[PDB]
């Protein structure tokens, strides 16, 4: 199964996303700490997601080091942010993010975005 990692400082966001992805056959692990995710990557080469969904607003880190570790490699990144982040597009462009979404999101847009980034057909 496709495997997605979410890093968002709100535990409720990771909870909602992992259940929604499970409903369409996509496994997901979620973190509130970018450092926690980075530590797993460094500890075991076998742990590699097919895509990362990254909260650019995480207080005190902004997901900067997660982005830096993945930059240039085979793991595409989708940026997520709050509904009133007027600048998320330029943020995504300069970071080499594959896509971006504002929270809250509807099912069709979220699933189509993730599936397109993963290179798989979307269920809806």
Summarize as ranges the residues that interact with Cl ion (CB under 5 A): 15, 34, 61, 63, 65-66, 73
Q: How far is the CB of 114 from Cl ion (least distance, A)?
A: 17
* Contact present, 56 and 79 (Cβ < 8 Å): yes
Question: Whose CB is nearest to Cl ion?
Answer: 34
Our CB check for Cl ion shows the closer of 59 and 73 to be 73
Maximum Cα interatomic distance, the chain, rounded to a whole number of Å: 37
Q: How far is the CB of 18 from Cl ion (least distance, A)?
A: 6
Our CB check for Cl ion shows the closer of 1 and 15 to be 15
Distance CA 53, CA 56 (A): 10
Q: How far is the CB of 22 from Cl ion (least distance, A)?
A: 9
Between the CA of residue 40 and those of 108, 114, 121, what are the distances in Å? 31, 22, 29
In sequence order, what are the beta bridge partners of 53? 6, 78
Q: How far is the CB of 75 from Cl ion (least distance, A)?
A: 5
Our CB check for Cl ion shows the closer of 36 and 82 to be 36
Distance CA 97, CA 69 (A): 13
Our CB check for Cl ion shows the closer of 73 and 121 to be 73
């Amino acid at each position: 199964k496709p495997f997605v990692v979410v890093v968002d400082d709100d535990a409720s966001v990771g909870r909602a996303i992992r259940r929604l992805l499970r409903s369409v056959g996509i496994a997901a692990d979620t973190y509130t700490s970018g450092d926690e995710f980075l530590d797993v990557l460094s500890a075991t080469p076998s742990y590699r997601p097919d895509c990362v969904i990254l909260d650019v607003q995480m207080p005190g880190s902004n997901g900067i080091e997660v982005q830096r570790r993945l930059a240039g490699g085979a793991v595409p990144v989708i940026f997520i942010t709050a509904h009133d982040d007027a600048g998320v597009r330029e943020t995504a462009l300069a970071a080499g993010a594959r896509a971006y979404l504002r929270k809250p999101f509807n099912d069709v847009l979220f699933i189509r975005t993730v599936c397109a980034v993963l290179g798989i057909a979307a269920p809806l």
